[PDB]
Amino acid sequence: ELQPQFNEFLANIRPTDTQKEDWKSGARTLRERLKNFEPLKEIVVSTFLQGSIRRSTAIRPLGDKRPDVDIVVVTNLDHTRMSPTDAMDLFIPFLEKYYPGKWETQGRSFGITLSYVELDLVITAIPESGAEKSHLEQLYKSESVLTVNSLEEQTDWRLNKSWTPNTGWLSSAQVEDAPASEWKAHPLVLPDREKNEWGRTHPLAQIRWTAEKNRLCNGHYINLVRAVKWWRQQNSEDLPKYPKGYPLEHLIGNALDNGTTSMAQGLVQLMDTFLSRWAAIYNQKSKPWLSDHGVAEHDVMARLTAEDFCSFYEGIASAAEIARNALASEEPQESAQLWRQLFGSKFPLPQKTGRFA
Amino acid sequence: ELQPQFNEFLANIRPTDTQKEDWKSGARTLRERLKNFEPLKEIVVSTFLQGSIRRSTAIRPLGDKRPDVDIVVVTNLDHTRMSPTDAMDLFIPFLEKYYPGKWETQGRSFGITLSYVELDLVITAIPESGAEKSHLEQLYKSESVLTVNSLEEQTDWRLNKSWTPNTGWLSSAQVEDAPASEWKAHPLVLPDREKNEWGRTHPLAQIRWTAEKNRLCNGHYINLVRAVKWWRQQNSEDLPKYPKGYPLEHLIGNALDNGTTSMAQGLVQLMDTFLSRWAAIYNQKSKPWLSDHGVAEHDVMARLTAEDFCSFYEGIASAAEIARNALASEEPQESAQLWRQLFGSKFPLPQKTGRFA
Amino acid sequence: QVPAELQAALTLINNDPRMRTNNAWALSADKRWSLKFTAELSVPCSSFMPDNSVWHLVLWQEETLIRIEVYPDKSEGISATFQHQNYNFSDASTREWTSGNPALENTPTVFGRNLWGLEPEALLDRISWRLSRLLLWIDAAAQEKLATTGDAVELPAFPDQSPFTVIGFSEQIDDLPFWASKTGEWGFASSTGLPGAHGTLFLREFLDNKGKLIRTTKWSPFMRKGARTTNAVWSVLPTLPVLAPWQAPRTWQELSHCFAQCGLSLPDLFSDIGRSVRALRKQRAPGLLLLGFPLENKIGDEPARIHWLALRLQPLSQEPIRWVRTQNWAADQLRTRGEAANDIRSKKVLIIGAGSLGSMIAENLMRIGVVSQGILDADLLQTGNLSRHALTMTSVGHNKAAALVEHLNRILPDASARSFSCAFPPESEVAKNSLRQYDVIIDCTGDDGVLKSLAAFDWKSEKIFISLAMTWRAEGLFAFAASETSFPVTDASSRFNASASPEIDMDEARIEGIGAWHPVFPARADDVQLWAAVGTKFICRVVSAPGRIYEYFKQMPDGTVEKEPHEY
Amino acid sequence: QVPAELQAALTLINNDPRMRTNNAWALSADKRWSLKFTAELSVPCSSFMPDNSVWHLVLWQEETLIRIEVYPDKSEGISATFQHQNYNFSDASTREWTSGNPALENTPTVFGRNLWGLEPEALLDRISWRLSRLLLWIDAAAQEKLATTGDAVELPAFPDQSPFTVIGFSEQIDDLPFWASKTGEWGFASSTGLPGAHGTLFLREFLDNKGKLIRTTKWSPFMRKGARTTNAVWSVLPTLPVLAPWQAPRTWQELSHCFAQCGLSLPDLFSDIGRSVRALRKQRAPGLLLLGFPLENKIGDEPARIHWLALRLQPLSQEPIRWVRTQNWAADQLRTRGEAANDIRSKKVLIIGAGSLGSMIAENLMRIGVVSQGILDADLLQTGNLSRHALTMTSVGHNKAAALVEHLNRILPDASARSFSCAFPPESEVAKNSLRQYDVIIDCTGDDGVLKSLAAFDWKSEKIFISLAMTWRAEGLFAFAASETSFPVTDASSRFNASASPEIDMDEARIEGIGAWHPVFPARADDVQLWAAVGTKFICRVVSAPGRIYEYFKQMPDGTVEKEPHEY
C-alpha cells in the first residue's frame, strides 16, 4: 500500500536533529542548574520532560519557528497554604541569574528561549502526605521518569521504578508496568490560566496509555497522529482553529482500533470510525464528551465549541472520501497523487569539511 | 649687524636632513653597484659628486619638489673613436637592471628618481694618454675626490691625493693644495646638448676655487650665494628667467671682495661692486665676458641675452637701495623689517616615540 | 541470536553474483562476528592468486568505533602479500583467518575515482562499500596492476618491526654516483645515539674492509658532539630486496634466495665479515647490517638516490629476521610539510637582540628553513623575562645569545647557528669582518643608539636592513625595510613618529618587583607571538622584493589585525 | 689644546650663581676630561651634607656614546650615600674623585615634572641639564626629602655584589604572621641548585635550632626533584639593616652597630651558632647567612611581606662583607610584566591533542598564568613533526603528552601539569573520574571521532567546551565554544560546513617522504603560531563570557586577519 512513500513522508514531517540535540541538552542542563541552586535545593523534587516531544507526536514548524518543549518541575510545597503566584514567584531569581534576558512569564508557565527550541516550564506540587508522598517522590526520581528519549526510540519503556534502559552491542528481561494501585489514584496539582486556583493534572498515565496504544497498534499510532496534524496544517483555510494539540490527539486515539496493519488502512479506518461514532452528535449540532486518561472527572473537549466540531466533521468527511478512493486505486502513481492531494507536496511520488590540527 | 637673525634665515633656507642622508646614501650605493657590474667593470674609472650640493650653494625647493643632485662617471674610453651616443647607450642595461622604471634619459644626462632626491649623471672621458692618464686616474681615485661631504662640513678639505679626513674626539697636519702643474692643464670631455660632439669641462678647479674663496672670506661666500638665490626666488615676477644656477654664482663670486666680516656688510659691498663694475656695459646694452675657472677659453655668460642682464642690473640696483638703507638703521626691529622686505617671511624678527622589543 | 544487521549482510553476500556463502555468523570470545565467504574473478587467474578465493568478514568494536575487516582464510585463502596489503602470516592459534587484510582504504590508480566515491556511515552501507572495494582489489591483484605508472613506490611491509627503535641517515642526489661504482662491496660503519631521545640512533661515517674513511656525514653542532662507535656493516645491492610480488623476506633463507637472484652470495659475505673481524684486533663485533640500493620516488622514473635498510645481525637458518626502521634526514626530506622559498633559505641572516621578539623570530626562521643565523646580544637571562620568551628556566644565568643559539641548534639536523657575546658595534676588527659576511641585518632591540650605530658602521657592501619594533601595551607594530650600503635612520625615525601610536602612561607600568624602582612595559606572550609571526611574514616578503618599505600594524579587540602602509 | 666645547662648559659653570670653579680641564690616560667645581646650597645644611660641596665633572666615550658623570671629590666631597646614588667609596688609586655618582636620571617626587623635562642631545645642553639636576638632587639630599610618600622603597646599593650568583625564595602575604612572632630567633635552612642553570640556587625548607621542620616551600615538579643540603642560617630582624641615611653596611663592624641599634647582638648570635653546630654531629658548617625583615612596597604604607637578604658567612673585624643577590619567586612576583585575568587563572584546563596547535596553546597558557593543565594524547613524536611544533629533537621517541608536560613544568616555578597517555575515551573508571575534575575542555585534534566521543561521554556536571581547528593550507581557523553538560556536535558540524573554506586539492599535498604513501597537509610554523595566539585570545574571551559562540578567521596575503562571526 505504497508503504515506502509513506515512510519518506513521515521522515520529511519529523523534527530535525539539530533541534533534537538542542532540547535534550537544554533539559539536562536545566535539571543540573536547578539541582545546584541553594535557595530552591529542598523545594525542587524533580524536573522531567512531557508533551508531544516525549510522546513522539510532534511535527516540524514551517519556517524558522522554534518548536515548543514542555517541562514540569515537581516540588514539595503545600498548595493548601501557598497561592500559585507565590510558588511561581519563588523561581524568578533563578531565571534572572542563569537565563538573563531570555525568559518570559506568560499565563501559568515560564518560557525560555534557547538557540533552536523554546522551553515551557510549569511549577507543580504533590497533594499527598506521609508515606504516599515518599512513594510518589521515589517514583518521580526514577530513570523511567527522568529519561530524555522519546517513545519511538525506547520501544521497551515501561512505567516502573525498577526499569533500566536496555542497551545492546548491536540489538535484558522485560519488566512490565506497575499496578494501577500505586500511581493511578495519585494526581498532581498545577496552576490555572489566571493563577488563582490549583487544578489537577496527571501526565504519566497519558504517556503510559500512549505507549500501550502504540504497542498494540504495531507502532503506527504516533505516525498517524503526525499525519493528521500535518493534514490539518495543509488545509488550514477550510478548517476551524480548534481542535488542535492534545484534544486532536485524543480524538485520533479514540477513533483508532487495535491491530493496525499499515498506514493507509489505519487512516481509512480512523476516518470511517470517526464518521460512524459522532454522526448522531453531528446532526444534533453538539460536541462529544471524552474523559482524560489521568483524571477521570475531566473533559478534554471542554473548551471546544459545537460549530468547530461540525466544521471538523465536514473536513474529516471530505478527507475520508479522498482516502477511500486513494486506497482502492491500483495504479501506484495515481494513488500517490491522490494521497498528495491531502498531505501536500511532501508526499513523494514513486558533506564533511576538512579540519586539521 | 643682526647676525643671529641672519643665521636663523640661513638655517631656514638650507636643505633638510632627510634629503641629505638620501643623496649621500644614494651616491654611495650607485658607486658600489657600478663597481660590481661586470660589463662596465673596466670601463668605469670613478664616480663622484659635483654641483651646488658639493659646493654648499643649494637652497630648499618650495613645495614637495625633489632637489637636483649632480654626479659624474669618469671612464677610460677614447672620444676620438666613439660617439657620445654610443657611450651613453652602453649604460642602458645597468639602469634597466638596478633601477627598473625609475630612470629617464634627457639631453646629455640620465636622471634617476629616488625617494626624496633626483640624481643627474653625466658620462665623461679622459682626453689624455700615457703616464698623464695614470696620474689623472690616481687623482680621481683619491679620498679628496670620492668624498660625499659638502664644503661646509670639511673646512680642512684640500685638492691633494695625500689628504685624509681629519677626525678628532671632540675637535692633524694641514696638507696644502697640489701644484697647478698637475691638474690645471688637464680637463675632461663630456657630451653636448645634442650629443653630437664632445666639449670640455673641469669641475675640480671650480670646487677648489670655491673652497679657497670661502676660506679667504671667513666662511661667508656660500651663504651669500644662497641668500642671493633665495632673493631671486622671492622676487621672481619682477626679475628675468636668467641668469640662474652656476652663472649667478659666478657673478656673485666675481663681485665679492676678499675679507668679508659679516653678512650684511658683504651683501652691501657685493651689490655696490656689481653696480660699479658693469655700469658701462649696462648703459651700452651689452653683456659681460667672464672666463671659467677650469677652462680659460670658455665664457660662462655665453647663452645670456643682453636684456636679461639689463633687467638683472635694475633689480640689483633696487635691492642695493634697500640693503643700504637697512644697514644704516640702528633700530633692530626696523632693520629686520627692511631685510624682510627683500628676503621674505623666512627672515626672523628679533619628539621621540616609544619602541619596545 | 543472530541480529538483524548480520542477516541483512548475509542476504547482501548471497545476492551478489560474484559472491557466495554457506556458513552463518559466529560470535567469538573477543566479541567479534565473523562470516566465511568465497569470491570470484572476472579476469584470467594468476599463479599467485586463484579465481575462487575464500575470505572471512570480521566485525568488532574497540571503544566507540566499529572495525570492518576482511581477512584471508587460513586453509583456502591467498598466501602471497601484494601491494596495499598487510603481511599475510598464519600463526598457531584458534583463529581461522590470517593477518593479510587488504588495505581497501588506499586508492590505487586502477581504482576508479567515481568507483571509489566516499565511505558511508551505516554499518550495512559500509559493508557493501568494503565488499565492492575488495572485489576491485582482488581483480587488480590478479592482473598485477596494483602499482602503475604515476604511483608512489611504497616500501613493502616488514614483519615484526619494533615500533620504538629508529636509525637515521643522510643521503642526497649528489651522493648517488659515489655509491654507484661500489655495487657488491661491503664495509664497516659507525653510529651515534641521539642525546635525550628514546631509542634513536644515527649514522656518522663509512669505512672500508681494512678500516679507512671514505665518507663523512655532516650534522648540526649539537649532533656532531658525540661518541662514534663502529658497529655496523654495509653492502650495496643492485635492487630492492623484495620477493614476488611484494613480499618482504621473513627468514634468512628467503633473503639468501633474493641475494642469489640478484647475483650475490650471503654466506660468502658472512665468511668475509668474520675473517676481516678476526684480522682487525680493534674491531669487536658488528651488531647491525645495512643494505643500500637505488630507489625511485615514482614508478616509471629513474633512480636518483640510495636508500638503506637495517636489520639486527646463519644465512641457511629459518629463524625470523629482526628489522629496524630507517629514516632519511636529508635537508629536502625534513620540511616536506611546508617550507620557505629558496631566495631566503640561501641567505646568511644576522639578528641583533636576543630578547622577546628576536628569539621567537629566530625560532620561526630556523623552523621554516633559514639555517645560517647569527645572534648579537650581551645581556643575561632572568626568571622574569620567561613570562614572554622562547627559553625556559634551564637557561637562567647564561648569555642570551649563547642559550638561544644552543636552542636553535637543537631544532633540526641541518641547523648552523653562531653566537656573538659582544655589543654593537664590536671593538675588534676581526669581529667587524665576521659581521660583514652576512646578507640580511635584522634589528629587534627597540633602542635608538643601535639605530645610530648601524648608520655609523661601514658595511663595505649593499645590505638589506630590517627594523621591527612594538608599541606601548603591544597594541601595534612598526616594520621598516631598506636595501642600501648604509642604514637610513632619519627616514625610519620620521616614519615611526608619523604613525598613530598609543601614548605612554605610567599608570599601567607595573614595577618589576618588590625592592625595586624601575618599571616594565606591559606585554603578554600571545601578543608577542602574534607580532613575531607577522614580522616573519614581513621579512619573507621583503626578501622577495627588496626596496624602501614601511608598514604599521594594529590589533583590534575583536581579534583582527589591520594594516596601514606608506606610499613613497 | 683645550677644545671649544669644554671652554663653553667652563664659562657655563662660572656664570651660574650657585657654582664656582677655578681649575681648568685635564685629559687623563683613559681619555677622560675632568673639571673640579664647587656647589652651594639654598637650604639649611645638614650634618651629612655640607653647604659648599666639591664635585668633579667627567666626560668620556666608550664605543659611540658620550658619558657625562659628576663624581664627589675624594678630599672635600660628600662621604655618605643617599637615595638615587651609587655607593660612595674611595679607593687607593690616582683618581681624584670617588664612585658615588648621583643617579640624576631617576626622577624623585621632589623633582618637578616641568623641571625634569627631557634630556637634550648636544653636549653643552646635556651638561646644563645634568648640572641643574645635580643642584636639585643636592638640595633634596640636604633636606632628607629624596624619598617621600608615594615613592617605591628601593633597596640600598650593596658594595661588591657578584653579578652571577642568585638566591631564590618564595614569601607571600599569608606567611607574614608566621614569622612575626619569631623576631630575634635563629635557625637553619636548606637550599637546592637549579638544574642546567648557571650560578642559581633556591631555598627549600626552614628548620629550628635543634633541627626540626617548621615550614616547607612548594615548587614545581621539576624543581621538587632535587637534593636538599642544609647550609644556611636564618635570623629575623625588626627592620631593614640600613645605615644612615641610606648606606648599606660594608664591614662587619657596621653590621654589628646596626644590630646593636636594633637591639640585638651579633657576637652572641655567632657564639650560639657555633655551640649548636658543635652539639649536632650531623651539621658540618653553614655557608650563608639570611636576614629577614618586614618590607613595604611604598613609603607610608604598612609592611605586608618578609624579605630575605643573603651574605657569604668575625663580628669585630673590618673585612668587607660579601653579598649575594636574592629574588622572591612568589606567584604574584613572577608575571608583573603582564598576566591574564583571575577568572581563567583559577580554572583547571584539559587539552585533548598534543600535536601542533595544542602544544603552542598549552605553552602560551602556561606563560600567561594558567598553571593547572592536563594533556591527553597517545601518539609518539617524530623528527618531521618538529617542522611545526613546540619541542625539539631531545623529545623524539617519547609520548607527546609526557614530553609536553615536562616542557611546561620547566617554564615557571609555579607550574603544575599532569599527563594522560590513554586515548579518549579512557577505559578505566578511575581515569574517567580524574577527567571529570576539570572545568574547561579544549579540543585541538581535528578529528570527528573525538567530537562524537565527547558527546557520548557523561561529564556529570556543566562544562565549557572549546573546539579549535585549522583549514586546508592553514588559510583559516574554526573556533567554537559552548557551556553545557553535553557537547553539541551537530551544531558544531553545521557551523563548520556553513563557513566558506578552501577546497582540498591533492596537488599541493606532498608525500611525507621517500618510500611512503600517505601525504601530509601543508602548513608552515608561522601560520600555526598565528592561529595559536588567536585561539588563546579566543579562549580567554570565551571564559570571560560563556555562551554559544562560533567564529571563523581568515588570513590575507597582505598580512591581515579578517573575522566572520555567526549570530544565534
Ligand SMILES: Nc1ncnc2c1ncn2[C@@H]1O[C@H](COP(=O)(O)OP(=O)(O)OP(=O)(O)O)[C@@H](O)[C@H]1O
Ligand atoms: N485539554 C487538555 N486536556 C488534557 N491534557 C491537556 C490538555 N491540554 C494540554 N494538556 C496536557 O498538557 C500538555 C501540554 O499541552 P500543549 O497544549 O502544549 O500540547 P501539545 O500536545 O504539547 O502541543 P503541540 O502539538 O502544539 O506541541 C499536553 O501534552 C497534555 O499532557
Ligand SMILES: Nc1ncnc2c1ncn2[C@@H]1O[C@H](COP(=O)(O)OP(=O)(O)OP(=O)(O)O)[C@@H](O)[C@H]1O
Ligand atoms: N654655464 C656654465 N658654465 C660653466 N660650468 C657650468 C655651467 N652650467 C653648468 N656648469 C657646471 O655644471 C654643473 C651642473 O650644472 P647645473 O645647471 O645643474 O648647476 P647647479 O649650480 O648645480 O644648479 P642648481 O643651483 O639649480 O642646483 C655646475 O655645478 C657647474 O660645475
Ligand SMILES: Nc1ncnc2c1ncn2[C@@H]1O[C@H](COP(=O)(O)OP(=O)(O)O)[C@@H](O)[C@H]1O
Ligand atoms: N502545561 C501543562 N502541563 C500539564 N498539564 C496541563 C498543561 N496545560 C494544561 N494541562 C492540563 O490540561 C487540562 C486542560 O486545561 P485548560 O483547558 O487550560 O483548563 P483550565 O483553563 O481550567 O486550566 C487541565 O486540567 C490541566 O491539568
Ligand SMILES: Nc1ncnc2c1ncn2[C@@H]1O[C@H](COP(=O)(O)OP(=O)(O)O)[C@@H](O)[C@H]1O
Ligand atoms: N652636468 C654637467 N656637468 C659638468 N659640466 C657641465 C654640465 N653641464 C654643463 N657643463 C659645462 O658648462 C658649460 C656650459 O654648457 P652649455 O651652456 O650647455 O654649453 P653647450 O650648450 O655648448 O654644451 C659647458 O662647457 C660644460 O662643460
Ligand SMILES: *OP(=O)(O)OC[C@H]1O[C@@H](n2cnc3c(N)ncnc32)[C@H](O)[C@@H]1O
Ligand atoms: O594536527 P595534528 O594531526 O598533529 O593533531 C592531532 C593531534 O590530536 C591527537 N589525537 C587525535 N585523536 C585523538 C584521540 N582520539 N585521543 C587522543 N588524542 C588524539 C593526536 O595524537 C595528535 O597529537
Ligand SMILES: *OP(=O)(O)OC[C@H]1O[C@@H](n2cnc3c(N)ncnc32)[C@H](O)[C@@H]1O
Ligand atoms: O624587548 P627587550 O628589551 O627584551 O629587547 C631588547 C633586546 O635587545 C638587546 N640589545 C639592546 N641594545 C643592544 C646593543 N647595543 N647591542 C646588543 N644587544 C642589544 C638586549 O640585550 C635585549 O636582548
Ligand SMILES: [Mg+2]
Ligand atoms: Mg507541546
Ligand SMILES: [Mg+2]
Ligand atoms: Mg506548550
Ligand SMILES: [Mg+2]
Ligand atoms: Mg644642481
Ligand SMILES: [Mg+2]
Ligand atoms: Mg642639474
